[PDB]
Amino acid sequence: AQYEDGKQYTTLEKPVAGAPQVLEFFSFFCPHCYQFEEVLHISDNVKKKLPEGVKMTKYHVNFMGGDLGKDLTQAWAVAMALGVEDKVTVPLFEGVQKTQTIRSASDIRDVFINAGIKGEEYDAAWNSFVVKSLVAQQEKAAADVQLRGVPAMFVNGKYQLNPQGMDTSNMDVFVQQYADTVKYLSEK
């Protein structure tokens, strides 16, 4: 075929009931995630090609960056609850990987403040139980697929993108292939 199991995607030996339709995992500590987000805009280009009526879920994970990793997963939860993903994603990546000015929960918070979320509102979210279950969700969804690496994408809890099996010599081309694969898997 043109899309074959084991080359552009892999199948899960243990499918995941009631999973989000399109589920992406990343970490602000992950160098390819930085690439996927800042250079390739994968998440964005996928969305531009998905059929109507399909939602994208993106979750942060804990297994990179130790203590600050978890902080970042809680901060990402705050981003999702406040709906400010678009406003912190870029400075969070650059703060962890480019300028390296994020060294503590407090530095993470500065980014939200500089992105215009108010302190009171951030601290309130940070400490809220809505955020606690949002952290819970992120952890559970990674748990359901025994996630050991990022970046990672999963479609309807059954298929996993395999970027290793796509030509990277052109970046525009890698992205479209990736997105088109997600679209094919979506319709499967």
Q: Say how many domains are in the chain.
A: 1
Write a three-state SS string for the chain: CCCCECCCEEECCCCCCCCCCEEEEECCCCHHHHHHHHHCCHHHHHHCCCCCCCCEEEEECCCCCHHHHHHHHHHHHHHHHHCCHHHHHHHHHHHHHHCCCCCCHHHHHHHHHHCCCCHHHHHHHHHCHHHHHHHHHHHHHHHCCCCCCCCEEEECCCEEECHHHCCCCCHHHHHHHHHHHHHHHHHC
Asked whether 7 and 45 are in contact (CB, 8 A), the reply is no
Residue among 78, 117, 81, 110 nearest 95 (CA): 110
Q: How was this structure determined?
A: X-ray
- Rounded-to-integer distance, Cα 137 and Cα 156, Å: 16
CATH code, domain with 19: 3.40.30.10
To 5 degrees, how large is the angle CA 115–CA 119–CA 125? 95
- Rounded-to-integer distance, Cα 158 and Cα 162, Å: 13
- Rounded-to-integer distance, Cα 69 and Cα 61, Å: 7
Q: What is the resolution of this structure in A?
A: 2.4
Q: Is the peptide bond before 20 cis (omega within 30 degrees of 0)?
A: no
Could you tell me the strand order of the sheet in which 22-26 lies? 9-11, 159-161, 152-155, 22-26, 56-60
Q: Where in the sequence is the domain holding 98, given as residue range(s)?
A: 1-188
